[PDB]
Design a binder for this molecule. Structure first.
Ligand code: GTP
Ligand code: G1I
Lengths: 55, 333, 231, 281
């Protein structure tokens, strides 16, 4: 109906104004986080069988 | 009809805005990182006892206990280390499509085709404690925000936040066009995202009670969604055999995961502890292990005789568990 | 140390309970009741009894379990019903002159159900209600079916047609024409994996349960015959 | 000259049976109540092809038994045991098909994993009762001069039996598991024909040889393999000096080949095909 079209207009109006950053900074942040937590996950690096609780 | 012109004008305006902010693609920056390499995994435990196909499972907060639901109408709480059962809760309705495990470890909830979410008390044996109603469509997922309030998403294009003590809706989230299929909460529990059936994932703010953003990268139904450990990104899996990594601050997608030899849908998506590996289930009777920053396959988790419908990773990042329609659960490592 | 023994005892008790429940689970047959609105889906269910509305009945020491769903143009939940014994389809045969005439929508729904990916090997039991309403309008009636269906002119009564006593040669044509409009869509894409069983149903009828029982028995027998490569 | 064909037959018997056993054991999707009987048949055929065929080939080529009396009696007893156990399993499979087809609503309750093991063990017990007991202890021995002459010799290993045992073993091993199979397959064919006729009556306008062909292979291979031997066996006892030794051993060896065709007959399902493609490919 007419209103459902109208509502889209106000919300879309809200999404339009928002503070956005360059994708390079976000990519660098994700890379930095992945490199910072790199050595603290047994899934990526197979730990020795001594500490494995499933073995 | 003035609005159709108006709305169209705004959608055109945002697309130019997101475009300007593309200093460089993520694949361009991530080019010289040493590859993860081949990832070899072997099953450690096999849990059996379910009478019918499995649709959902959820790991406990202690990385020790987990719950699962099947079409036989029965919830079972296993013991991952000692591969033996602990509980077995019957159900009033035989069709269940979701389950959850409370962060405090005292309650377990489940919903299904019948439009009611039920909460059970485990530390009293186990008897139904509260029944929540108000949804006009079948439930798809539910997650325990805390020990007193739960957020659910149903098939009537709505999501809501409940209050267990009083049993009445507190806030209602609307704006989707098609059915809602999955959701995931932020690590600090202030925001959550949902994947609809209209190829559009939205962001909500329980406190704001209002939508903030929307992402429309896909072209088919969205089946699952997972949230990056950082809190600034999330990943999605749809019926077009693709996975896409969106972003919050950049407000646009960064990379897509797909292969030319697979044409089946996607059922579940999950991350690892560090967010370097993106594990995603498929309808090809097996699972795949992706690479978050380079989009290169690094392993296959095969061994299931039917489609994979569930996937979860322990909070300790030790083991990954999968569920299939073959009525069997597995624990990989 | 004794905690492990207590946990093992609990495991054993749960396993015994599950083993007890498995036989009862395997014994029953699950049926799905699906149809359009004003079809009569609720009634047929009432005769069998004497968000999801379940029901159970037992015939000849065999127990059945019926489920009625529900309202969406796309039904995603239908992927959960790929293990049922059969799908019961209920359609109002007298509504060709109502409201996109209600029949063509029913035909489109049936075609959508037949070609679904998750229901490749599920048979369909088809019920044609309101036979009584159709005849009163079809014969001694104001309007013809042709106006709403041009193909009625180039259609002859099937020779195999077997009219029951006291019925005119026009109403038989209408009934068999309506039945063939569904039989056409059933035969072309099956591949022999699944079949359809047409039936004629009215309000004053008491043999529906026996018909369902016989159809389920035939479905099981045909599946077993095809499995062993004798059909 | 014969060595090549005997080795080929032995390898063919062993390979198919071991492949079927491994395929059934490794994969959990094939563990079905019906598949236990096929497993038992595979074990019986493997034991036969590994025990009786090679030593029989050695005996026929050498024309002189190089073992003692005990080994010859043991070999004869294991031959009888394997042959007897390889047919009642086929009869049980036919009866299982009959029950599954003609009684669709009671198949699940009547046949359970607990009853299948009992039936299989009963079949093996009745097979072993008529093979080891009457042979290992001397009841198969004959009284005529050639029989005792061969019994005295330590290097003579041939076959000589009385009328009673020769009739009882044949009746237990062949005819009883034959009339049952004939009746069962007649009933199954009738049911299949009725189903096809009903289908044609219901919807023939828009749209019986498969069942006939399948029953053709299933019955014909077994009947042609095992029929002439189990009549010449009675013939050469009911009257003397009509059946030559060479034709007898030839018919017996023709009967042995039937244990190599069962994997090609009862394991043609597409699930078995994908299982066989999964490994050793
Ligand atoms: N005249 C007539 N009325 C019928 C017949 N079958 C059902 N009804 C009437 O239909 C009324 C309501 O519709 P139903 O046919 O029961 O169907 P329903 O389940 O309510 O409708 P939907 O679920 O929306 O398909 C009942 O009060 C019945 O008396 C029939 O064959 N003839
Ligand atoms: C040495 N070959 C044996 C000799 C007699 C015999 C066989 C098979 C079944 C029987 O009941 C028998 O009495 C043959 O396989």
């Amino acid at each position: 109906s007419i209103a459902q079209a109208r509502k889209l207009v106000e919300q879309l109006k809200m999404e339009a104004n928002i503070d956005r950053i360059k994708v390079s900074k976000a990519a660098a942040d994700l890379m930095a986080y992945c490199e910072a937590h790199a050595k603290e996950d047994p899934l990526l690096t197979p730990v020795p069988a001594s500490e494995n609780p499933f073995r | 009809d003035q609005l159709r012109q108006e709305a169209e004008q705004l959608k055109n305006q945002i697309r130019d805005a997101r475009k300007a902010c593309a200093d460089a693609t993520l694949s361009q920056i991530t080019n010289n990182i040493d590859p993860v390499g081949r990832i070899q995994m072997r099953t450690r435990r096999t849990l059996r006892g379910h009478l019918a196909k499995i649709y959902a499972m959820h790991w406990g907060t202690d990385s020790r206990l987990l719950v699962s639901a099947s079409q036989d109408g029965k919830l079972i709480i296993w013991d991952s280390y000692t591969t033996n059962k602990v509980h077995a809760i019957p159900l009033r309705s035989s069709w269940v499509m979701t389950c959850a495990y409370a962060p405090s470890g005292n309650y377990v909830a489940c919903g299904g085709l019948d439009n009611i979410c039920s909460i059970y008390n485990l530390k009293t044996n186990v008897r139904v404690s509260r029944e929540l109603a108000g949804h006009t469509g079948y439930l798809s997922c539910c997650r325990f925000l805390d020990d007193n309030q739960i957020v659910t998403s149903s098939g009537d294009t709505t999501c809501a936040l409940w209050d267990i003590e009083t049993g009445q809706q507190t806030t209602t989230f609307t704006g989707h066009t098609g059915d809602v299929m999955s959701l995931s909460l932020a690590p600090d529990t202030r925001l959550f995202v949902s994947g609809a059936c209209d190829a559009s994932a939205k962001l909500w703010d329980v406190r704001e009670g209002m939508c903030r953003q929307t992402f429309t990268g896909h072209e088919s139904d969205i089946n699952a969604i997972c949230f990056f450990p950082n809190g600034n990104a999330f990943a999605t899996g749809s019926d077009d055999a693709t996975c896409r990594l969106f972003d919050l601050r950049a407000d646009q997608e960064l990379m897509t995961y797909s292969h030319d030899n697979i044409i089946c849908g996607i059922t579940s998506v999950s991350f690892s502890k560090s967010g370097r590996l993106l594990l995603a289930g498929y309808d090809d009777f097996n699972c795949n292990v992706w690479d978050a920053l380079k989009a290169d396959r690094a392993g296959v988790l095969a061994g299931h005789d039917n489609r994979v419908s569930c996937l979860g990773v322990t909070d300790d990042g030790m083991a990954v568990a999968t569920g299939s329609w073959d009525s069997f659960l597995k624990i990989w490592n | 140390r004794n905690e492990e023994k207590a946990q093992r005892e609990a495991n054993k008790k749960i396993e015994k309970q599950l083993q007890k429940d498995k036989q009862v689970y395997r014994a029953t047959h699950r049926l799905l009741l699906l149809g359009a609105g004003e079809s009569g889906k609720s009634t047929i269910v009432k005769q069998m009894r004497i968000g999801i509305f379940e029901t159970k009945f037992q015939v000849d020491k065999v127990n059945f379990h019926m489920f009625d769903v529900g309202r969406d143009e796309r039904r995603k939940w239908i992927q959960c019903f790929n293990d049922v014994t059969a799908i019961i389809f209920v359609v109002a045969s007298s509504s060709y002159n109502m409201v996109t005439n209600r029949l063509q929508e029913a035909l489109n729904l049936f075609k959508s159900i037949w070609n679904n990916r998750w229901l490749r090997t599920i048979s369909v039991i088809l019920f044609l209600n309101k036979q009584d309403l159709l005849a009163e309008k079809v014969l001694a009636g104001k309007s013809k079916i042709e106006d709403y269906f041009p193909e009625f002119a180039r259609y002859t009564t099937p020779e195999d047609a077997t009219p029951e006593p006291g019925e005119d040669p026009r109403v038989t044509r209408a009934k068999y024409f309506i039945r063939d409009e569904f039989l056409r869509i059933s035969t072309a894409s099956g591949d022999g994996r699944h079949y359809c069983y047409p039936h004629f149903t009215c309000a004053v009828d008491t043999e529906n349960i026996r018909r369902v029982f016989n159809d389920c028995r035939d479905i099981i027998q045909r599946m077993h015959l095809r499995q062993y490569e004798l059909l | 000259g014969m060595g090549i064909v005997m080795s080929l037959i032995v390898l063919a018997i062993v390979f198919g049976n071991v492949l079927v056993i491994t395929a059934i054991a490794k994969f959990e999707r094939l563990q079905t109540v019906t598949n236990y009987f096929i497993t038992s048949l595979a074990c019986a055929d493997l034991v036969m092809g590994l025990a009786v065929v090679p030593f029989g080939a050695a005996h026929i080529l050498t024309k002189t038994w190089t073992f003692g009396n005990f080994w010859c009696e043991f070999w004869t007893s294991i031959d009888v045991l394997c042959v007897t156990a390889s047919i009642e399993t086929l009869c049980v499979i036919a009866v299982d098909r009959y029950f599954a087809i003609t009684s669709p609503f009671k198949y699940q309750s009547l046949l359970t994993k607990n009853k299948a093991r009992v039936i299989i063990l009963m079949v093996w017990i009745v097979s072993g009762l008529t093979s080891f007991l009457p042979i290992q202890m001397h009841w198969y021995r004959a009284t005529h001069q050639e029989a005792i002459n061969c019994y005295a010799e330590e290097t003579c290993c041939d076959f000589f039996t009385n009328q009673a045992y020769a009739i009882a073993s044949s009746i237990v091993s062949f005819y009883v598991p034959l009339v049952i199979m004939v009746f069962v397959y007649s009933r199954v064919f009738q049911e299949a024909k009725r189903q096809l006729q009903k289908i044609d009556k219901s919807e023939g306008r828009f749209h019986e040889h498969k069942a006939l062909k399948t029953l053709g292979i299933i019955m014909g291979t077994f009947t042609l393999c095992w029929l002439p031997f189990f009549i010449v066996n009675i013939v050469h006892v009911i009257q003397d000096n009509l059946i030559r030794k060479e034709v007898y051993i030839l018919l017996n060896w023709i009967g042995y080949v039937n244990s190599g065709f069962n994997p090609l007959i009862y394991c043609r399902s597409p699930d078995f095909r994908i299982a066989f493609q999964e490994l050793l490919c």
